[PDB]
C-alpha cells in the first residue's frame, strides 16, 4: 500500500532524511517519520529539528512496505544502540521487504550489528573500511536483490537513492515522472532511467 517507515534520531543527517521523505511523498507514498527514543522531535546533525509523528516503539513492520534509514554519524550510532530499530531491520527483512540505508548507517548499523551479512553494500566513503572488502560496492546506489537491500553513500546521492527506491517499489515509470521536475544533473537522470534495466 506504498507505506514507508523512516526512523529518525538525534544526530540523523537531516538533508538525507528530508530528501527521502519529500521524494517518496512526491511519488504518492505514505511516509511515516518515527523517532528513536521517547521524544517525537529530534535534533538533526546540523541542528535542524526533525518532527516525527510517532515513536519507533509504536512501529510494526506489517504496517509498512519498506524501511528507509537515514545516515549521519550520531544518528547511525543511535540506530545501532536501539533495540527497537535493530528488531525492525530483522522484521522487515524477514517479511521480504525492501530495506534501504544511506551514508554511515550501512557501516555503523549493518556491519556492526550483523545485519545483511553476506550482502553487497555501499556506504559513505569515509566508512568504506567497515564493509568486508569482497562485499563493498563503490556504486553511488547499490541494490542487492538477494536480501532486498538498497544502499547509498551520502548527502549528494540521497536524491538518486530515493528515486531508486521508487523505481524498485513502484516501477521506473513513476520514478522517471517524479525525477523530471527535480532538475537532477543529466547524469543522475540517465542513471535512474537505466536503473531497473541494470538489474
- Give the residues lining the site for Na ion (CB under 5 A): 35, 37, 55-57
Burial 13-24 (b: 16+ CB within 10 A, else e): bbbbbbbbbebb
Give SS3 for 41. Answer: strand
Q: Determine which residue in the list 13, 67, 149, 175 makes contact with its own copies, applying CB under 8 A.
A: 13
Identify whether 103 is a catalytic site residue: yes
Q: Kindly state the smallest distance separating residue 38's Cβ from its own copies, in Å.
A: 18
Q: Kindly state the smallest distance separating residue 7's Cβ from Na ion, in Å.
A: 9
Contact partner, 73, from Na ion, Cl ion, its own copies, none, Cβ < 5-8 Å per class: Cl ion
Question: Catalytic pick from 59, 103, 123, 142?
Answer: 103
| Residue 46 in the binding site for its own copies (CB under 8 A) | yes
The contacts found for 84-87 with CB under 8 angstroms, 24 or more apart, are 84/36, 84/56, 84/57, 84/59, 85/7, 85/36, 85/56, 85/109, 86/113, 86/115
Closest-CA residue to 51 (of 79, 21, 81, 72): 21
| Residue 155 in the binding site for its own copies (CB under 8 A) | yes
Give SS3 for 120. Answer: coil
Q: List the catalytic residues.
A: 103
Residues that bind its own copies (CB under 8 A): 13-15, 17-19, 21-23, 25-26, 31, 33, 41, 44-49, 51, 124-126, 140, 153-157, 159, 181-185, 187-188
Amino acid at each position: 500500500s506504498k507505506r514507508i517507515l523512516v526512523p529518525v534520531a538525534h544526530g540523523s543527517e537531516e538533508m538525507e532524511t528530508v530528501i527521502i521523505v519529500d521524494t517518496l511523498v512526491r511519488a504518492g507514498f505514505q511516509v511515516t517519520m518515527a523517532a528513536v527514543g521517547d521524544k517525537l522531535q529530534v535534533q538533526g546533525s546540523r541542528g535542524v529539528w526533525l518532527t516525527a509523528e510517532q515513536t519507533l516503539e509504536a512501529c510494526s513492520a506489517e504496517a509498512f512496505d519498506a524501511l528507509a534509514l537515514p545516515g549521519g554519524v550520531g544518528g547511525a550510532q543511535a540506530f545501532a544502540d536501539s533495540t527497537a530499530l535493530l528488531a525492525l531491520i530483522d522484521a522487515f527483512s524477514q517479511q521480504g521487504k525492501l530495506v534501504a540505508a544511506i551514508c554511515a548507517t550501512p557501516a555503523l548499523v549493518f556491519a556492526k550489528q550483523q545485519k545483511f551479512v553476506g550482502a553487497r553494500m555501499t556506504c559513505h566513503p569515509n566508512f568504506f573500511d567497515h564493509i568486508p572488502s569482497e562485499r563493498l560496492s563503490r556504486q553511488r546506489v547499490c541494490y542487492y536483490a538477494t536480501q532486498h537491500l538498497l544502499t547509498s553513500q551520502g548527502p549528494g546521492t540521497a536524491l538518486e537513492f530515493a528515486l531508486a527506491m521508487i523505481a524498485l517499489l513502484a516501477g521506473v515509470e513513476l520514478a522517471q515522472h517524479v525525477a523530471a521536475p527535480m532538475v537532477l544533473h543529466p547524469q543522475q537522470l540517465t542513471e535512474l532511467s537505466g536503473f531497473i534495466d541494470a538489474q
